[PDB]
Amino acid sequence: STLIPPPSKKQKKEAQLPREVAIIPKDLPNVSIKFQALDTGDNALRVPGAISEKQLEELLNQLNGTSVPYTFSCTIKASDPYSSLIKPQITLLYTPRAVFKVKPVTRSSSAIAGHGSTILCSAFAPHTSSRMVTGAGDNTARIWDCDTQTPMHTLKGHYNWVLCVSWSPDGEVIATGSMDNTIRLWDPKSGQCLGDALRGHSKWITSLSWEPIHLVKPGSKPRLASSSKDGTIKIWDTVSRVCQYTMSGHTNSVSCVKWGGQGLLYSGSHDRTVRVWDINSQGRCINILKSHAHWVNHLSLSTDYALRIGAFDHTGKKPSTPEEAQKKALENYEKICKKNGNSEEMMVTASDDYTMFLWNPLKSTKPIARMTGHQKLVNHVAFSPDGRYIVSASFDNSIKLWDGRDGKFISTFRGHVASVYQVAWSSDCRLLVSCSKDTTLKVWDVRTRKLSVDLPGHKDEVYTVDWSVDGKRVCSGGKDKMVRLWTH
């Protein structure tokens, strides 16, 4: 193997002297600092010195009147959180932490056997990390008890591949969009065919999406939304199993379907155009956005993390009634979204022209910024759970991290040697896992823009990656027909 050059002779003779122990001398020649938030707050003239960076936190708690945690930074010059004077009046910027720590995911649990073909899609339950669903290259899906690393409840009932699986945002049903243009629903605890296979599309199903819980009528259940290679976007209500009303705007294949916080479906297609449907208007497109030069893959919203769980927070509890459920869901959405008091959900687009666009489709029909710098197609893009970081993966082995509010450039994550197929965030928005065309998975620490761990163990490509909601497990799988769970 290739070796780091060995240290010289004078360097060895240097490394033996006494060396540089800091002392924290006195040290309170007091500097007047300016406590100012990120959004709008500048709250007010205090002059401390070299004090505890955990006492600055308590200062802010007692000042803003809550005693919560706060992260800090200064002089957005190298924008780094006595440590402000060891290297070199001075301001101070802060963000809320919402402390819920997620240890990294280092080891590797057992490589679970399973299907007889490759593994195409995988998803984690929103209520517990104990169950998890995978659709694979056979005509079936499977459920895995991650608690004991064992299989359960294989769901036969298709006759072609299963291309997307989704677990409803209430933890009640699972949906499997397949190759034969059927769509089937299944009960977790039983494994029985919940009715017959919904249908109505002429070519395969590309993506699925659910109705966010904070808008569903209490006493009822959420609805579906299905994309298909034919171009239709169909709605479905999961009690009557009837096609409510379709949408047929695009012309080429449609890649992905979303569902916003105000009831606005977004859809990007292979026709290089992003459409903004509507549900209060019976499904007539109200906005068309044409900015890309090639076709579009994997649009993504600003709140698509909060909209995915629906009142099942990181503490694994449950609701007993839709009354408490709807309040919990509204609280979640407001905690994630309300950073100015309005419905400022943004959208990010990823297309085959190496460039992404930063839309706010509500306020206007123009992009706020054009994020550029890749050198091959962008296969996947994602927003942070708190919404202030965009991560993008691409077929040129790189990953890029952008400031998710206006669209600047922050950093690049090198380290893969083949294409990056997709990425995923953790709960506390501090780590990020990614899978690639070569074997290895990689975990990156966003707080410092470095590589934390690099975990091999697969044998062929890897197609899916899913971190849990409470950060306890990470699931992966691909061309070698094995499921793999990684833990701390």
Partner: protein, 271 residues
């Protein structure tokens, strides 16, 4: 009889070699393991099987001779709801899970700190004198301790279901040993062709009417109760130690004095 010079010559083994409990060849390889790269402590999970008991202990050696961090005994499984079969595969699994969850709690992980990182807890399997067979219930404790969230290097060649000529595991046969599935197949298979040896074996089952389903249903709830409460509440321990001391100083035998042996010699010489 025996030659007096031979008895003056021959040398004795170690005490625990005499009482054939310890393996002093394995112990060197397992304690003075590496040991030339760094100086890192080295804990070791031990598991032991008596009749009607499963014992697990996280042992750390030392100069004075040993220390114990966390222990677990199968005879606590009723506290979480398992009364029958306190020595089987499912009991081994539950004990492993319990010891792992207990030590994980006590170390302070969920609900010299420079260069901060949790640094998961690494331990090794002290098999003792147990023979290694594919299916033995000393690897079930291993599986349980691992699934509890402890880190113990291992492999799969000794789990039930490993096929030989085709080197790969089978998942379902393994899952049907975590929930007593073998014992339940035995129950449902023997409940028909015999009732003498269904009232002789599983005699304790009938006094509560536990059937061929609720085994799998109670093992899961046992796991849930374990993950909810590993805190190891002790026994109330009635009859404070002084009572036992005064009680068992009665049946305790006793030596004699020297002036006792001094008179018996004259009594003999007189007799």
């Amino acid at each position: 009889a025996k030659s007096s010079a031979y008895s003056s010559r021959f040398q004795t083994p170690f005490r625990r070699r005499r009482e054939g409990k310890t393996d002093y060849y394995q112990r060197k390889r397992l304690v003075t393991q590496h040991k030339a790269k760094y100086n890192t402590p080295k804990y070791r999970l031990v598991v032991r099987f008596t009749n009607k008991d499963i014992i697990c202990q996280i042992i750390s050696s030392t100069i004075t001779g040993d220390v114990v961090l966390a222990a677990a005994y199968s005879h606590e499984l009723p506290r979480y709801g398992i009364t029958h079969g306190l020595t089987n595969w499912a009991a081994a699994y539950a004990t492993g899970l319990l010891i792992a969850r207990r030590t994980l709690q006590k170390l302070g992980l969920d609900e010299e700190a420079v260069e901060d990182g949790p640094r998961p807890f690494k331990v090794f399997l002290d098999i003792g004198l147990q023979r290694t067979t594919t299916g033995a219930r000393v690897f079930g404790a291993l599986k349980g301790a691992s699934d509890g969230g402890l880190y113990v290097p291992h492999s799969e060649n000794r789990f039930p279901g490993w096929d030989f000529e085709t080197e790969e595991i089978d998942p379902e046969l393994l899952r049907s040993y975590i929930f007593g599935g073998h014992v339940s197949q035995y129950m449902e298979e023997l409940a028909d062709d015999d009732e003498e040896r269904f009232s002789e074996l599983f005699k304790g089952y009938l006094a509560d009417d536990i059937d061929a389903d609720s085994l799998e249903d109670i093992y899961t709830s046992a796991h849930e109760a374990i993950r909810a409460d590993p805190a190891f509440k002790p026994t109330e321990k009635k009859f404070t130690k002084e009572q036992y001391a005064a009680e068992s100083k009665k049946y305790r035998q006793t030596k004699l004095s020297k002036e006792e042996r001094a008179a018996r010699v004259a009594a003999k010489i007189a007799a």
